Symmetry: D2
Subunit: 169 residues, 4 copies
């Protein structure tokens, strides 16, 4: 405890990147024809999902799922079916790559037309389980970050920008 | 089922209202001191929650709950609300039955304070007296979609509030 | 850790008591007319519920609920509605009286015709929150007990009898 | 909907079979060494689970799961099954689709071993090849109730397996 937070990725930049991601997601699926659904992982992805789904110019459903972050268990499964649909898992950040990994396995079992992941933040240096991540907003070093869904002791989750937890002594 | 969606509340108007609500909500708890948490009711309020919490200038946590004749908890909160100021975040209120119950349930956990902030309000359909401290818009009884709200699992992604036309 | 378990309440005695409880529950509701449902609290009440519901000679539904044992939260709510029905919460043991207390408040909100509690074991000396318990199988001192649903470090939950954890040194 | 329930498998026959299953299941894992857990699928198997685990003479944990076109987890396990022997406890298997999926899901968690033990089996209705290591009874395609199984949320409390007659 005892710290401060400084802006790392300004709100305006996040917006710009999400717009670009939006164009990409749109391009990648506009011609699929079949149903599409962006699946967000609670709690972390609520804000990113909000902004992102608005930038996706292709009709889709929005469902949320919440898995325990040693066994990965489902605390709240999807409400809608994903069989035969293009599914785009949406997370705020990927580091160890464990949850996204297992969640992706769980969902493939329901035999969807396709499965891809989209994460606002990517921390390559922390990957433990290799998992394919199609769309990434920003690649950053292993920095203590908060905001935009990412919390620190139940805090900063509502920050419109990505912050860096400094930590005084 | 064939239908049309017409804009009802354009994106900019919502943005502006959310900003006002933020100010109001901020002014209301900025001096509480106790911890604060905004509770969104899935699925419909995820978007409203995302934009609203950014406009709330007071350190708070963000949790979600999802409730369904009896009102049952499909997914409870992750946080304890006891002794905290709790702002329930809803997308829309009409009958008033659901918020009515969800509020009762949370009240049992004895929070510092309990309140509700709904984006839309169709007071023409209330069948239950329920305290609603914050309202973004009071509206006609139209079938609204967008900004989180759906229609046959559709339209939640629209950045504006729309009305289904049907024919 | 490092211990042994000795029989405290033999399986045959448990059966006898449950039969008696069964007669009582049956007597108490046989003339209600309205729907009845025994609500069990997982994990602990699964075995007790199994035996008990068979001793209740009055048509009823069997539903389960599972609440976190500081705020009491619902991890899995009831599947069926209880409004206007006689509800009999079923637990393996009541001590502090906290969970049963909150669970009872949660359920009264759904306005059932009636709410009562039935617990196999009662530990009066540990009550922190006073809550009415209509049917009790056995009243025991604050003993380290296991079996019949009550576990000790994920163990003894399948014992057909109530045991006492001795604890060597 | 008007109907009649006739006994199909009397209480004593079930008691005896459960005893046998216990012996079999016991003999099968008594030398594993690794931790063991029987997983019951709510709601229907709660009774079968209660009687079966008592007949299993090997230290184990007892957990429950409840699954629902897609097979979704309404309530996951409380325990981790990784590296443990897992015995899925079901009340009845017919199509085979549900157990089929639940098994896939648990398999992902990499348990020491995975198996299924169902009380009833209607092999005349299988549409999916699924491994079932233990079966209490193989039966005709009757509509069974009792011993946990229901009919319009009714009859789960019967101590015997019955068949609905309809007229
Ligand atoms: N899609 C959609 N859902 C609605 C509408 N009006 C009410 N609802 C549903 O009813 C709930 C609110 O119920 P209340 O609190 O009034 O009982 C909302 O969470 C929402 O899911 C509407 O116009 N469109
Ligand atoms: N009440 C009742 N449920 C049944 C019956 N046959 C199948 N089921 C349901 O189907 C599930 C098993 O499905 P399966 O594994 O064969 O796909 C059981 O958990 C049960 O809930 C029946 O005769 N009566």
């Amino acid at each position: 405890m005892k710290h401060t937070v400084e802006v790392m990725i300004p709100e305006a930049e996040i917006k710009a990147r999400i717009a670009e991601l939006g164009r990409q997601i749109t391009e990648r699926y506009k011609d699929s024809g079949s149903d599409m659904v962006l699946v967000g992982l609670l709690r972390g992805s609520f804000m990113f999902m909000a902004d992102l789904c608005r930038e996706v110019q292709v009709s889709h459903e929005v469902d949320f799922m919440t898995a325990s972050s040693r066994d990965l268990k489902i605390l709240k499964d999807l409400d809608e079916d994903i069989r035969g649909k293009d599914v785009l898992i949406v997370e705020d950040i990927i580091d160890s790559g464990n949850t996204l990994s297992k969640v992706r396995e769980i969902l493939s079992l329901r035999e969807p037309k396709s499965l891809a992941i989209c994460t606002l933040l990517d921390k390559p240096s922390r990957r433990e389980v290799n998992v394919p991540v199609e769309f990434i907003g920003f690649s950053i070093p292993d920095e203590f970050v908060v905001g935009y869904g990412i919390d620190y002791a139940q805090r900063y989750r509502h920050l419109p920008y990505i912050g860096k937890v400094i930590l005084l002594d």
